[PDB]
C-alpha cells in the first residue's frame, strides 16, 4: 500500500479475494452446478467469472491468432476499471462482452456491439 498506493492495493486484494472464492467454490460448481449456492456467493461467482474473462488482453504480438489489433492499456485506467467492476457498476452486462478486451470503455463498447448484433 505504501508503494503503489492504497487504492491500488485494495483493488488487488479484492480481486484476489473474489478469485480465491471462485477457486474454493470450484468443486461444488463442478459437481452440482451454479444453482446450489447462496445469493451472495452466486453473485460472487458471477462477478468472478466476469473478472476472469476481463483479465484477457489482446496482445500486439499474438495478433494473428485472435484477429484483434493490440491493446496497450495503461495502469490507472486498469485500476479504475477493476474498481468499477468490483463496486458493482456493471453486474448486468453479459459475461462474453468482458472477454478479450482492453479497458472498461471497450467493455461498454463491445457490450454495445453485441447488443446491436443480438438485439
Amino acid at each position: 500500500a505504501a508503494v503503489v498506493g492504497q487504492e491500488h492495493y485494495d483493488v488487488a486484494s479484492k480481486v484476489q479475494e473474489t478469485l480465491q472464492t471462485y477457486k474454493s467454490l470450484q468443486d461444488i460448481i463442478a459437481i452440482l452446478g451454479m444453482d446450489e449456492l447462496s445469493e451472495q456467493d452466486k453473485l460472487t461467482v458471477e462477478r468472478a467469472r466476469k473478472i476472469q474473462r476481463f483479465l484477457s488482453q489482446p496482445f500486439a504480438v499474438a495478433e494473428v491468432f485472435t484477429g484483434i489489433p493490440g491493446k496497450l492499456v495503461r495502469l490507472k485506467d486498469t485500476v479504475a476499471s477493476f474498481k468499477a467492476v468490483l463496486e458493482g457498476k456493471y453486474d448486468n452486462i453479459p459475461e462474453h462482452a468482458f472477454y478479450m478486451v482492453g479497458g472498461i470503455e471497450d467493455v461498454v463498447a463491445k457490450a454495445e456491439k453485441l447488443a446491436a448484433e443480438a438485439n
Partner: protein, 103 residues
C-alpha cells in the same frame, strides 16, 4: 498431490456418484407417485375453471401474492426463477402483501 489424497478423493467421489444415482432413482419413484396428484388436481380444476371460461369473470381496477415452492433445496433453477418472477411482478406493486408457502 499424494497417492493418499487422490485415493481419498476418488473414494469420496465414487460415494458421491453412487449416492446421486440413488437419489435420482428415488426422485423418479416419487415423480411417478406425484403424477397421480397432478392429474387429480388438473382434471378437477378443469371442472371449475371451465365455468370461469364461460362465465367470463375479467377483473378491473393492495394485492396478495402467494408462491408455492419447496422447504428443501437441491432442485436447481427453481428457487431463483420463481423469485425473479416475483421480482418482475412485485416492482409493479411494491406495496403488495406476500404469503410464501415453502422455506
Amino acid at each position: 498431490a499424494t497417492l493418499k489424497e487422490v485415493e481419498m478423493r476418488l473414494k469420496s467421489i465414487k460415494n458421491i456418484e453412487k449416492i446421486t444415482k440413488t437419489m435420482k432413482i428415488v426422485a423418479s419413484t416419487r415423480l411417478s407417485k406425484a403424477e397421480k396428484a397432478k392429474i387429480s388436481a388438473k382434471k378437477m380444476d378443469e371442472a371449475e375453471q371451465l365455468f370461469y371460461k364461460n362465465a367470463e369473470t375479467k377483473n378491473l381496477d393492495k394485492e396478495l401474492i402467494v408462491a408455492i415452492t419447496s422447504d428443501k433445496g437441491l432442485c436447481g433453477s427453481i428457487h431463483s426463477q420463481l423469485a425473479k418472477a416475483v421480482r418482475r411482478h412485485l416492482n409493479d406493486q411494491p406495496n403488495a402483501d406476500i404469503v410464501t408457502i415453502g422455506d
